[PDB]
């Protein structure tokens, strides 16, 4: 029995700039239990029929997890671009796997703002698929040298999602789990 409960029902999720990867293996993975669950706001699966997964086995199923705004959920898909897709978390054009998300306004938001969850705003170039960059160096915006101390035209690369109980839906927190699917198989239905 695959520990999906430790990936979907976890106490705390990582920030998008530093997302968590848990490898599910040597177990039985029931994917019907998570699909027919009305708790999910979206279940967009790529490469595979979301209903046939319960008949398939795979070699290694990686489960990535992070917290992003509702308006950005559409960026967690192959072929997409955007502030998250390009600098925080990128999927390959030949991605195979499921992108699962749900509203967590009752969990990652509090009165006066939940600013514990960061997201990279500045990066020199677009990152590669499944790359994870957690450097906290000062970003130089112009031709003038910052020397690693914030000041004129140079900024700290991360920002805070100001999550509050009264945010519009687009600005409410969403928890995202991405199940990437890929010799001998170890994860069968």
């Amino acid at each position, epitope marked *: 029995l695959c520990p999906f409960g430790e990936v979907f029902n976890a106490t705390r999720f990582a920030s998008v700039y530093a997302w968590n990867r848990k490898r599910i293996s040597n177990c039985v993975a029931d994917y019907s239990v998570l699909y027919n669950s009305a708790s999910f706001s979206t279940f967009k699966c790529y490469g595979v029929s979301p209903t046939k997964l319960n008949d398939l086995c795979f070699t290694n199923v990686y489960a990535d997890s992070f917290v992003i705004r509702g308006d950005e959920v559409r960026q967690i898909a192959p072929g997409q671009t*955007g*502030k998250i897709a390009d600098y925080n978390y990128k999927l390959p054009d030949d991605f195979t796997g499921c992108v699962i998300a749900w509203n967590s306004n009752n969990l990652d938001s509090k009165v006066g*703002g939940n*600013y514990n969850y960061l997201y990279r*705003l*500045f990066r020199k170039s677009n990152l590669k698929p499944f790359e994870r960059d957690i450097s906290t160096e*000062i*970003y130089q*915006a*112009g*031709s*003038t040298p*910052c020397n690693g101390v*914030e*000041g*004129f*035209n*140079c*900024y*700290f*690369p*991360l*920002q*805070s999602y*100001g999550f*509050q109980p009264t*945010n*519009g839906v687009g*600005y409410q927190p969403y928890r995202v789990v991405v199940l990437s699917f890929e010799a001998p198989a170890t994860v069968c239905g």
Partner: antibody
Amino acid sequence: QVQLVESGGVVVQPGGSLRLSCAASGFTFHDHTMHWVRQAPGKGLEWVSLITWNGGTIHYSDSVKGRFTISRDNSKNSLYLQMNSLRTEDTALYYCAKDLGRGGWYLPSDAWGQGTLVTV
Amino acid sequence: QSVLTQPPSASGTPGQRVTISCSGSSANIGSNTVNWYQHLPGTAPKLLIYSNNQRPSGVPDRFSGSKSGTSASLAISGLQSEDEADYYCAAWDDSLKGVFGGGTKLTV
């Protein structure tokens, strides 16, 4: 979901003084630099002042230099502007704005407030 | 009576691409970055382009810009009737402080 709310939009007889105040929410306040920007009626946008997060550096536009004072209180998430020695030339819609990132500074960026009309 | 120079107006037919020029001195644009704003009368200004050619989230790829020596421009493609607004150029000056251009009124 960033908001900035300006107040103090009252009419002051020329040669008098006025203080404005800009409540902020929806973002980290203590790590951000902020600015004031004014729009004279029928004209474009003018830059007034920024104050960095730690009060390290403060700069004024030469039109308001020596008469306007900017200050902030990070424990109340509010920005203040004390304008003294008012001139009829200062009639404008005043706006509150923030910078792009944390720590650093340059110019008014993404979140602007609705602003408030000051008549002299 | 302004430091960054922009034409008072611009215009074009929907589906066409138009440009808004901005010019300045060596201490304005030559040696610092350019931001562009879009101001629709009745509401607050927003930030369209920053650091010469970068975009904030919410701004579509119909809006692009560039910097060349001391001059700068904003290119607006696929003109829609919803973009009939006043556009502004800004660069930090070394001797002078924060500079905003006169502003260009773009009409359909």
